[PDB]
Design a protein around this ligand. Structure first.
Ligand SMILES: [Zn+2]
Ligand SMILES: [Zn+2]
Length: 544
């Protein structure tokens, strides 16, 4: 059984493009790969195909990393190809060829093949049972043609597979593993309960605070280079709770002596007290020389009772979704995440014994983006009371004109400074700040820098995530209603407020909001966080 090696060349409309495709074949087996793979210069993931000519078993192999190979196999692929014959004949490289035509996804592919050598093969899977394919033409434009056919001693692919372990998978899993090999996933939580129960307690991996409403762990983040992108993904459903709850995925900056973790582990008294003239006290909401507030990776709101209530609440024409996905790009927080062991947590404020179930992961993608260029991150304030069920007061501070005011010191000039600002308004009645628009005003060094009214009018779009939403006499459901910058079942986007360039030295940032008046025991309040972003330039000698 003589073995042959066929080398191919790609063209577009006469223009020769390359990493040449190679087929190695004899009457028993054929191997399809390319130059870079043959030479062990191909980047992961890469694929090879092999056909067992005794039984037409087609095997696809994916090389995922230096050690891991997956394969998927199928002995029906060749039989399913449908070709139409033509009378066209000719020669390629001295071999007699016939042309046949096939159609895949509206693309037309002409295949020219020889049977002169009593072996089969080709530059792709198409036509592999017809003969040895020496030329393919895709939509009359894209051509792959053999440039040489040579005899060789044997089909020997032992070095290709040497040192690697191979595992057969189903076709869907095979593709999935190739996909996941292209980027880094950092697992955090998988099907974790977030609830309210006196029985809730920490274990050796997950710490739990707020009577079950806060789950926290330490996770190691690799070095992530400037240019890479970073996303956080959370999946949620109700395990009993009917309500639209405030949620956060957060990290805890520990660069100063005190952190939000001090509050969580010791108690709310360990947090610095903030006061602004309104007669009340607030805890851990502002940076001080000894303390940084936590950073919100993603602020989200649960829908009303998704999953748990789906079969319980039947409304004609409403087929409820099973769970809620939330995914946010957090590329700008790279400087706070890169190469650190971080404390990362999830909060859903609720009072339900069944509560909620979530999953959470981070992903890091090998990009070289040039759009988000900050190398500096400083958390300046966070009024969101993640410790709601652990003694932290609601953010009712905005009835004073002083609002939230923070002083901080920059040691180096900051170019393109921005305030990453997440705001939501609360107070759940018709004249409460959940439902009435209020202008948020941001000041830098005592001067107004930006004023805007946070408002969402798209909430009716997410109706099918919200089975337990209350239905009113006017024909609307609670989840439909326009709100101060959130909708049940969705993320609240940060805004990126341009502050210009900042000099080294002392600065102040201030937020003022005309907070609505209470109604009986009901209060309005504002969950606001601010992270300062910017680009510090570098000092450097001159060289070429
Ligand atoms: Zn083989
Ligand atoms: Zn240099």
């Amino acid at each position: 059984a003589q073995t042959y090696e066929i080398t191919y060349q790609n063209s577009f409309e006469g223009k020769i493009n390359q990493n040449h495709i190679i087929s190695i074949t004899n009457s028993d087996k054929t191997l399809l790969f390319n130059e870079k793979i043959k030479n062990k210069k191909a980047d992961f993931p890469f694929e090879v195909n092999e056909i067992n000519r005794k039984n037409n078993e087609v095997s696809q192999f994916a090389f995922l990393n230096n050690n891991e190979i997956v394969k998927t196999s199928d002995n029906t692929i060749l039989a399913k190809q449908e070709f139409k014959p033509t009378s066209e004949t000719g020669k390629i490289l001295g071999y007699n060829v016939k042309k046949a035509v096939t159609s895949v996804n509206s693309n037309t592919i002409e295949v020219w093949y020889t049977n002169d050598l009593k072996v089969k093969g080709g530059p792709s899977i198409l036509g592999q049972d017809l003969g040895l394919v020496l030329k393919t033409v895709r939509n009359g434009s894209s051509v792959v043609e053999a440039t040489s056919v040579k005899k060789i001693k044997a089909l020997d692919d032992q070095s290709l597979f040497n040192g690697k372990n191979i595992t057969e998978k189903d076709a869907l899993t095979y593709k999935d593993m190739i996909w996941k090999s292209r980027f880094i996933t950092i697992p955090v939580f998988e099907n974790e309960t977030i609830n309210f129960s006196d029985a809730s307690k920490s274990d050796q991996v997950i710490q739990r605070f707020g009577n079950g409403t806060i789950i926290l762990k330490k996770v190691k983040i690799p070095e992530i280079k400037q240019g890479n992108t970073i996303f956080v993904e959370l999946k949620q459903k109700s395990n009993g709770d009917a309500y639209d709850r405030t949620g956060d995925v957060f990290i805890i900056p520990q660069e100063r002596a005190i952190s939000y973790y001090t509050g969580l582990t010791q108690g709310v008294k360990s947090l610095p007290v903030y006061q602004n003239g309104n007669g009340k006290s607030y805890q851990g909401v502002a940076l001080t020389p000894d303390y940084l507030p936590f950073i919100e990776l993603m602020r989200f709101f649960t829908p009303f009772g998704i999953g748990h209530f789906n079969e319980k609440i039947q409304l004609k024409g409403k087929n409820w979704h099973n769970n809620t996905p939330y995914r946010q790009d957090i590329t700008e927080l790279r400087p706070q995440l890169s190469g650190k062991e971080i404390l990362i947590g999830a909060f859903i404020g609720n009072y339900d014994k069944g509560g909620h179930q979530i999953s959470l992961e981070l992903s890091i993608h090998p990009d070289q983006q040039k759009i988000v260029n900050n190398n500096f991150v400083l958390p300046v304030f966070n009024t969101t009371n993640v410790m709601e069920m652990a003694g932290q007061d609601y953010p009712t501070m905005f009835n004073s004109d002083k609002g939230v005011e923070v002083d901080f010191i920059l040691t180096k000039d900051l170019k393109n400074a921005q305030l990453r600002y997440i705001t939501t308004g609360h107070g759940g009645w018709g004249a409460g700040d959940e439902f009435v628009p209020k202008e948020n005003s941001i000041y830098l060094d005592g001067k107004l820098a930006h004023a805007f009214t946070p408002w969402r009018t798209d909430c009716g779009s997410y109706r099918l995530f919200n089975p337990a939403s209350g239905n009113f006499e006017d024909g609307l459901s609670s989840s439909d209603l326009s709100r101060s910058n959130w909708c049940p079942g969705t993320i609240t986007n940060p805004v990126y407020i341009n502050l210009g360039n900042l000099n080294a030295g002392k600065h102040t940032i201030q937020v003022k909001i005309p907070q609505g008046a209470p109604e009986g025991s009901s209060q309005s309040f504002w969950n606001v966080s601010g992270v300062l972003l910017g680009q510090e330039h570098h000092h450097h000698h001159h060289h070429h």
